[PDB]
Scaffold this active site. Sequence first.
Site, PDB file in Angstrom:
ATOM      1  N   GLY A  36       0.727  -1.188   0.064  1.00 26.18           N
ATOM      2  CA  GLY A  36       0.134  -0.039   0.016  1.00 26.18           C
ATOM      3  C   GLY A  36       0.872   1.301   0.125  1.00 26.18           C
ATOM      4  O   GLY A  36       1.949   1.115   0.441  1.00 26.18           O
ATOM      5  N   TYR A  37       0.254   2.232  -0.527  1.00 27.27           N
ATOM      6  CA  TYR A  37       1.194   3.625  -0.573  1.00 27.27           C
ATOM      7  C   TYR A  37       0.789   4.550   0.338  1.00 27.27           C
ATOM      8  O   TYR A  37      -0.265   5.005   0.319  1.00 27.27           O
ATOM      9  CB  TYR A  37       0.938   4.061  -2.106  1.00 27.27           C
ATOM     10  CG  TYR A  37       1.657   3.421  -3.170  1.00 27.27           C
ATOM     11  CD1 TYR A  37       3.140   3.635  -3.498  1.00 27.27           C
ATOM     12  CD2 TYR A  37       0.951   2.411  -3.717  1.00 27.27           C
ATOM     13  CE1 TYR A  37       3.810   2.789  -4.259  1.00 27.27           C
ATOM     14  CE2 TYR A  37       1.577   1.577  -4.780  1.00 27.27           C
ATOM     15  CZ  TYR A  37       3.267   1.719  -4.961  1.00 27.27           C
ATOM     16  OH  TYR A  37       3.751   0.945  -5.834  1.00 27.27           O
ATOM     17  N   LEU A  38       1.714   5.131   0.996  1.00 29.39           N
ATOM     18  CA  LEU A  38       1.217   6.102   2.101  1.00 29.39           C
ATOM     19  C   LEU A  38       1.068   7.650   1.351  1.00 29.39           C
ATOM     20  O   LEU A  38       0.379   8.495   1.700  1.00 29.39           O
ATOM     21  CB  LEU A  38       2.457   6.333   3.101  1.00 29.39           C
ATOM     22  CG  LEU A  38       2.359   4.969   4.162  1.00 29.39           C
ATOM     23  CD1 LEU A  38       3.551   5.115   4.970  1.00 29.39           C
ATOM     24  CD2 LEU A  38       1.204   4.851   4.811  1.00 29.39           C
TER      25      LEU A  38
ATOM     26  N   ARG B 258      -5.011   3.066  -1.669  1.00 33.74           N
ATOM     27  CA  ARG B 258      -3.978   2.901  -2.584  1.00 33.74           C
ATOM     28  C   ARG B 258      -3.006   1.620  -2.088  1.00 33.74           C
ATOM     29  O   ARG B 258      -1.954   1.492  -2.262  1.00 33.74           O
ATOM     30  CB  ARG B 258      -2.942   4.136  -2.339  1.00 33.74           C
ATOM     31  CG  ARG B 258      -3.647   5.633  -2.755  1.00 33.74           C
ATOM     32  CD  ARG B 258      -2.458   6.595  -2.409  1.00 33.74           C
ATOM     33  NE  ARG B 258      -2.227   6.490  -1.069  1.00 33.74           N
ATOM     34  CZ  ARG B 258      -3.112   7.109  -0.093  1.00 33.74           C
ATOM     35  NH1 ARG B 258      -4.357   7.863  -0.474  1.00 33.74           N
ATOM     36  NH2 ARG B 258      -2.739   7.195   1.192  1.00 33.74           N
TER      37      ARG B 258
END
Lengths: 150, 146
Positions: free
Chosen positions: A29-31, A78
């Site tokens: 997952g993208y922060l 995301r």
Amino acid sequence: GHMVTEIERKFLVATFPDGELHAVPLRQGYLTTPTDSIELRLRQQGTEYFMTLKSEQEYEIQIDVTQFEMLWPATEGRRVEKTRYSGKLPDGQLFELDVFAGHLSPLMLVEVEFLSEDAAQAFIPPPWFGEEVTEDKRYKNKALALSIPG
Amino acid sequence: EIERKFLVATFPDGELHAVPLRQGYLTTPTDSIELRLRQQGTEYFMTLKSERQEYEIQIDVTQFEMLWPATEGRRVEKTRYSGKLPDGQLFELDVFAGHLSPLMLVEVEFLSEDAAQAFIPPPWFGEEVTEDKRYKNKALALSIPG
Ligand code: NA
Ligand code: NA
Ligand code: NA
Ligand code: NA
Ligand code: NA
Ligand code: NA
Ligand code: NA
Ligand code: NA
């Protein structure tokens, strides 16, 4: 000179295969969002957990499960969650087969690795492979993470 | 929270407790989130803010120093001294390191607006900067050498 970047083709999957498969559940997952100055990604690979920082140079720290689950919620929207199966076709080419979870269901993708950049071009897909998506921008990892339910 | 902040004209004498601090931004203020690293004496933190949600994880020293280099150009390093003025108001006095030298700042906390407005600075305080945007923490972090 020797291989620098791997050679691969990716397909939809028409039929889940039979045979020896090794399963690894994956959550990543993208922060950050792609316009940010850096890319910060969280991943779980089995039982190990990492945070990666990239700027365009790359930093990777291993984190524990509690650090990971505390930060995971900030990746909502995301993320890609899937189970990855590793196998081998009859001729010996190795494949990775992803079965996507959550809103990306029912997607399944198979990616094949080739030793020569002409075995790649000679490849005849087996009948269980669906349509090729190697060149389709929508099926790249970050595209899949950034796509949305509904 | 009731406070005024000043330059420091003379480092004070008296009881001071010292804490070294290092804190830096992995992100730039246009980013969708703010990610900050801080070392507070002997414990280390990464904070994620997005305007609101806030996340804080404690990290170890090895995680911290692995990631510290990606804060370069957006950091504040300083030693913080805690003390108390003769009338009892607590103060925090920061002595900044690296390119922010020779800056020193003193911040005072008050129990009332009336006490804050009545405050007479002692002679060791310099000019007040409570309102100067330049002396805010993130402004200090984002300023650069030269
Ligand atoms: Na998504
Ligand atoms: Na073979
Ligand atoms: Na779906
Ligand atoms: Na087929
Ligand atoms: Na700076
Ligand atoms: Na008093
Ligand atoms: Na200086
Ligand atoms: Na003075």
